[PDB]
């Protein structure tokens, strides 16, 4: 069961990182956008992935929101996959 989870966990980190980069790439050039520096963008992707998203940061551009949906999806899927495996194992 450490494979079905382990795999997802990889994809998750890859998405979080790529997402944080693409968001800053997509949001810049957007007047009033606040998702425009890497560090906080990484924090943004994680709170989104885990689907918590406090709203302190979020995207305002199309591609930013497209990056968003992918991060959310990857997130749900990953965490659900790790939970499925972790549950089964027990």
């Amino acid at each position, epitope marked *: 069961q450490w494979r079905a989870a382990g795999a997802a966990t990889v994809l998750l980190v890859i998405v979080l990182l790529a997402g944080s980069y693409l968001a800053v790439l997509a949001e810049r050039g957007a*007047p*009033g956008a606040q998702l*425009i520096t890497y*560090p906080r963008a990484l924090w943004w992707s994680v709170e989104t992935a885990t689907t918590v998203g406090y709203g302190d940061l979020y995207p305002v551009t199309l591609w930013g929101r497209c990056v968003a949906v992918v991060v959310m999806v990857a997130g749900i899927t990953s965490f659900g996959l790790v939970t499925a495996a972790l549950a089964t194992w027990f």
Partner: antibody
Amino acid sequence: QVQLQQPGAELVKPGASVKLSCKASGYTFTSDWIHWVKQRPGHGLEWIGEIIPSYGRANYNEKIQKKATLTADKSSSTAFMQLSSLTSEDSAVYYCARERGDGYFAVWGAGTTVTVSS
Amino acid sequence: DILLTQSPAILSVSPGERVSFSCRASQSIGTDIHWYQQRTNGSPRLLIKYASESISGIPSRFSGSGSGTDFTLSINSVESEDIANYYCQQSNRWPFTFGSGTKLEIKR
């Protein structure tokens, strides 16, 4: 050692256009953004635009009139700002700076004094 | 876009004294404000980043304070080498912006 190298000067006749440069050195990442700041004698700093060489995208200041076009050259680590159809107004010192994507400009260029005269 | 108000434009202080330059944001920007020094004919020089975080190579004479919309750059015991133009710059919302500037001026 000095990180951003900019040509000390560049003369230009009204209506003409010059392509400034800025060659890098030291540490480089894919998260690096090169910015350009205009500064007329006496007055302060004015952000002009930015570019991410490790992708090529550039955004420009929408308040001011667009008179520039940023480009980069990964290999030579050189960023280019193309200023077209200049006028007395465009004459000033232009600095390029490196921003680690964290919001502040750690290091700046010596700036290129540009004069628009006949 | 965010407006950085730097006033007064000139500050006159006596040597060794403490001086404070203030920068006000048109809206809350947390602590995404950064300070630069620029001496006559020099290029800007990062002094303080993120409002308070220090920078290596910069006198411990320099310090920052504030959050939201009100920021202060300080100098303890000014001195000739400190005569310059100080600017504040924010990275809270795009596109980054600059303060009008504040010229320090020592009275000897």
